[PDB]
């Protein structure tokens, strides 16, 4: 929800990055520049905020610096118009910490395009050509709209490998439909 006397509330409407009060970032979106940590929160008039990441043993002031997938923390330091940190009514520095999960789908999305390129080869029967494409599009949609754990991304890489194996050559199909 929102911490007692804070000037910043975490924006839950961005379901792709915010869930159950936790933040999620896909390095793919970071590389394609689709992420801006300051849009994940709502600042009430008269206060500015500067975010800071904390992963391993270092702090990152700019999301682009994030290079590894893992568990980290997103923190938002709130400041008043005087440039100094805001002190909440309870007498504490007004800061907002969000548990962050960093994952990267880059590899998966490529593995998908590979299988997709393969699936569209007219050498494969249209039933498999399509069953595999549906499979890929279902995953694709999911990784675009929903946040995932890196552990979860790798499992979908496996699902894709398996779907690619469903492809069936028209040649084979034609030798089976043969009755001697």
Curated annotation (Swiss-Prot):
Protein name (Swiss-Prot/TrEMBL): C protein alpha-antigen
Known function: May play a role in both virulence and immunity.
Cell location: Secreted, Cell wall
Miscellaneous section: Identical repeating units define protective epitopes and may play a role in generating phenotypic and genotypic diversity.
């Amino acid at each position: 929800s929102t911490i007692p006397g804070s000037a910043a509330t975490l924006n839950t409407s961005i379901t792709k990055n915010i869930q159950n009060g936790n933040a999620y970032i896909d390095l793919y979106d970071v590389k394609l520049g689709k992420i801006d940590p300051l849009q994940l929160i709502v600042l009430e008039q008269g206060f500015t905020a500067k975010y800071v990441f904390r992963q391993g043993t270092k702090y990152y002031g700019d999301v682009s610096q994030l290079q590894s997938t893992g568990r980290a923390s997103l923190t938002y330091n709130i400041f008043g118009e005087d440039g100094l940190p805001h002190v909440k009514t309870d007498g504490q520095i007004d800061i907002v910490s969000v548990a962050l999960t960093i994952y990267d789908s880059t590899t998966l999305r490529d593995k998908i395009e590979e299988v997709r390129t393969n699936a569209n080869d007219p050498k494969w029967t249209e039933e498999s050509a399509t069953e595999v494409l549906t499979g890929l599009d279902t995953i694709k949609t999911d990784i675009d709209n929903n946040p995932k754990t890196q552990t979860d991304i790798d499992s979908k890489i496996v699902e894709v490998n398996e779907l690619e194996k469903l492809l069936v050559l028209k040649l084979a199909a034609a030798l089976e439909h043969h009755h001697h």
